[PDB]
Amino acid sequence: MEVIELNKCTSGQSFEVILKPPSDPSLEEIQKKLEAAEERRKYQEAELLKHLAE
Amino acid sequence: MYTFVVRDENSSVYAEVSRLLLATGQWKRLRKDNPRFNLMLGERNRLPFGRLGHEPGLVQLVNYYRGADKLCRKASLVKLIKTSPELSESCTWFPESYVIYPTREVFLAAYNRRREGREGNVWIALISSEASELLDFIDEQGQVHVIQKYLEKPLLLEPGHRKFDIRSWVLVDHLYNIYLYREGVLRTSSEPYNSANFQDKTCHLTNHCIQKNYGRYEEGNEMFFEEFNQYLMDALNTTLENSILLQIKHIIRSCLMCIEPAISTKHLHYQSFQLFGFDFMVDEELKVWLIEVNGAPACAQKLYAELCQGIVDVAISSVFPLATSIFIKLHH
Amino acid sequence: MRECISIHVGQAGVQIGNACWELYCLEHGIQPDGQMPSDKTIGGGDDSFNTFFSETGAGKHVPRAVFVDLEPTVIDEVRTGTYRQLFHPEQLITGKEDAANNYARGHYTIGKEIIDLVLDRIRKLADQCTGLQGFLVFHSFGGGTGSGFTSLLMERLSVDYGKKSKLEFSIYPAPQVSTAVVEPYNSILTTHTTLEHSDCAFMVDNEAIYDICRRNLDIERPTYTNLNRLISQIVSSITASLRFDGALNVDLTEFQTNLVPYPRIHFPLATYAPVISAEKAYHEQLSVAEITNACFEPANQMVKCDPRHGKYMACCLLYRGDVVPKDVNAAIATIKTKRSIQFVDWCPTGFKVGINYQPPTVVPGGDLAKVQRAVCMLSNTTAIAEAWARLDHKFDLMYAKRAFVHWYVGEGMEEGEFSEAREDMAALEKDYEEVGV
Amino acid sequence: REIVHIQAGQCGNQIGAKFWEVISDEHGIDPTGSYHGDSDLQLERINVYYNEATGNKYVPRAILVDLEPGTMDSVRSGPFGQIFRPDNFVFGQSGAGNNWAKGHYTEGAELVDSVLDVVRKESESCDCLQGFQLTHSLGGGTGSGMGTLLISKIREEYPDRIMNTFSVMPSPKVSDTVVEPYNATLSVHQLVENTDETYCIDNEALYDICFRTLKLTTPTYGDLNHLVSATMSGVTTCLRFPGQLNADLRKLAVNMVPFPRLHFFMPGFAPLTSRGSQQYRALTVPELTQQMFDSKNMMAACDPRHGRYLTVAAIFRGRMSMKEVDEQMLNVQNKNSSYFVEWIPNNVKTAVCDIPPRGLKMSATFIGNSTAIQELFKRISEQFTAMFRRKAFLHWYTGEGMDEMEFTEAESNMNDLVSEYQQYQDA
Ligand SMILES: Nc1nc2c(ncn2[C@@H]2O[C@H](COP(=O)(O)OP(=O)(O)OP(=O)(O)O)[C@@H](O)[C@H]2O)c(=O)[nH]1
């Protein structure tokens, strides 16, 4: 059981103990996703306003 | 009204437990995929243990021990016995075995002193006596099984020089009490045993179904405990308890106390019990050896009623009580 | 010194932020008006606590924090609460109508209208930093804001701060205190979109915290205040290395380095002990061995699962109080012989230990007792995937009938994102399985 | 989050007046609009239903609509009559004649713009209007025909707001005219399209509760409206008092409605009480839970055991153990799990409010989205077809410009809604 890298200070200490060794989307891509979803909302809204007009 | 679900319809044991539970008037059966159950008689493979114990207002119990497969697979059983410090040195009750792959050097090391020791040396997978006659047998199967020293000098029943194995049913409840059913079964060979050649196979290994001469001495090749004890008394001047049963209890206790830290559900959000089937065989020195451990065993037809009622008594009603014992408690 | 900015999103993120920052103040001797008498360098500094607090010329220590909610009621309680003077008003951002438990409404509909305002307020803190490390993001899985807006915010922070580490504190949904039937949907949607933008995420199952409060605190019916003050203790022990002197986990990159060898498997299990009721009349104070042993009981974990049936990729022990290395190594040796601790074959079987000598601080008049020593274990075990399996199952039960999907499609989302998110979760479950067996 | 309330027709204005009487008492508002109550929780969310006027008076954000003045003059002369803003009384004179076509197409078309003007003026005063609630019957003319015309036009001008209705279903046991199945069927066609949440208040259920349970041999509309006001108070508890959820109309719709057309809820109340009579024994939390799930406490004459629950919302009022409420609520689901669809996990939500309603130490309000509500529409469909097959009483409608095709289409949409509810009962 090996105790390694012991570092001490006023606040406390730290160490590792070993029992055994080993055996993005861009800004424009985001803007064109939020805007595609907005147009889909606006299409659904226009479809309702056409239905209500009928 | 307690609730339960049934997710392995091929279970002879737990099909009977379902009817026993329904005939109480206090257990209602639900649909397989209804999550609002008290008890789960779960499937055999890929049982969703991670979904148990997360239903508020429900104490949940399962008829399987997660991790018990390490005892119930021939490969892992061998690995568990050789690697666990709780077994290896004083494992006089397990036959020398080695795990082989079809894609060893330790296996030949023993068979090469057997080659230069001039003693018996037949091993088993489906049997042969030469090493490479099963090595070819292994590489064509495509899966993995263990190589295992065959017991050349078994205890033979009379009349008829017959071979047998013993099946013991053990119930481990949610508190890890180990309950050994007092009724075992000897699965006999209805054929005289032959040591000359292993090509004639259906006399060596006593499978209850591979006996497809038959029922000559007792029904269905099943000899129960009272007669076998009577035979031991008449033939050998001993009892089943002293000559065999002490070692069987020692082996069951040993195997289950070993994996206890890995499978216990003591402080777990769900609870587990499981019925096991231990298979033993006895040599002519009245020495007991462990063959395999079955995690989903089937009972003998005469004992389905008594054992399944005991499962309800000990493993189910103890957790879910309703509005002389047939088990022997193995202490630890 | 390198600064860290905390971002609290939605009700769960905001209220846990209150709990953590109230605790940070008590730990650092920071006063409700922002004054800190023990700080002798007035107006600035590069001390360890300055990672979380900036300084004004008048001696006020202000959190490097931003609170954002799509609805005013919860942040309004911060604006008028006991710590109202601690926060600069521009750090508290509210909308007027929330995401209504809808991931798509928080991510697409409402989030597109407020994401630019948030990033600028976040930019105002980043400009005060001489060497920013990254962000700590607090949110729920189940809320529409906590799921939907966080994912969009995480996406943008990778664009504007692609150099910086991002840690999550995520509240996993539990029916006993949940508020919406569609929380499995929101959890899957937000985990999929956020997965590649998070370096390390600490999941907290509300069910685990609920039962710990019931069992160990004798609280009949725990409230958010009960849960959050316990959660704040665990968050505090995790961030203590960033706010105090020490050699272990001094930087956000060290969390990934020590806990996450595989990028996608970045959900370490946290286990905390001891949790002791303040109303307990006689309490025998628990030793190093007893509290370290308690780290391997599932009843003390932030997520209920069975590490015995998984494999460890990393293990950190964070002690606070009267602890010396001799007692730790002695306790580890005893535990190693009696417990199933299996590591993967390509990682060393070893513990990284950090000890702070100051015992844990507790809120006065709270539910937790003052203890002589405590520990938080951070272990990356495959067994945490049980929580994903539970979540994915509830998702599959609802989505098979397409129940509630129209609420998401009606906000601009396409049905295909459900199956895309679910596919990713299926891949995630496979990754844990390859590593786990 | 303000709500704009609208009451239309005789029934809509009579149950609407009772609603404003009950909640005004709960919030400590007197018939003059002055708050003389004792608790600050009575005013924390008075914003939802009341506007603040000069002199610190509270004025209901309510609009009173009818095609004849008789009922609305009865409201003004009523007990809480002076609390309403006089400009919000919008009435005609010709009446509706229990004719959906008169309310929707002719007489109601004259008046509908004047109503929408008052809606707009109440909406502009709103900090953040969350939606609308309408009280009306479906068997008459004004509340049925003009009420659904208002809903269509309100959705045209406020398409992203929530539309919630308290709709009284007609029953031959409490029947004014024979054409009530015609008006209800035409109205249900509108409600399926243009509302997010509809509380189905069945006059058949209200009669049976008054007859069998409340031991009233010949109940009036006033005895029926006592049950409606107590139910309306309970389902709006979370809107009017603070809680852990911060409840609003949209979150309820999101969590109760798995498919947009299946938004017709079964209300329920416990304990069941008559007027004047006073409960003496307070109910145990186990008794509150058992009664609130009882079929005999449901306000829609449907057997819950004939269908399955998609979602359920329950609201407990009073000082009680939240632990006991949790165990009793979990107890019903665990003991009756077959009646809750397994493909919506954890489909029961429970809220608790400390302040009880007047007269009770504790109460419980039930809101169920059950596939058994199809029994109500099937009942209406049967009475509809028994007349339409002979085109009986149709001249009252063709005389107002309607074609037989519109009746056939409305019959088909409701029959579709029935089979859609049946689709999910077997799943
Ligand atoms: N532990 C804890 N969990 C919380 C808290 N507040 C809410 N939650 C959980 O978060 C989930 C709901 O998400 P919220 O954060 O409340 O919703 P939101 O993020 O504000 O998003 P909206 O839908 O717009 O309101 C539920 O599972 C709650 O149990 C809290 O203070 N502490």
Ligand SMILES: Nc1nc2c(ncn2[C@@H]2O[C@H](COP(=O)(O)OP(=O)(O)O)[C@@H](O)[C@H]2O)c(=O)[nH]1
């Ligand atoms: N519950 C209840 N139902 C009513 C009341 N008044 C009328 N109804 C029912 O509503 C239908 C008549 O509609 P009504 O509102 O009077 O016609 P309208 O004035 O044109 O809207 C019939 O089914 C009546 O049974 C009432 O005060 N309470």
Ligand SMILES: COc1cc(C(=O)c2c[nH]c(-c3ccc(C)cc3)n2)cc(OC)c1OC
């Ligand atoms: C508008 O009035 C209300 C609103 C809300 C609400 O905002 C909310 C949040 N969540 C849920 C909810 C509902 C059902 C299920 C299965 C899961 C979650 N409802 C809840 C109310 O009472 C429960 C209420 O009073 C009827």
Ligand SMILES: [Ca+2]
């Ligand atoms: Ca300083």
Ligand SMILES: [Mg+2]
């Ligand atoms: Mg919120």
Ligand SMILES: [Mg+2]
């Ligand atoms: Mg009338």
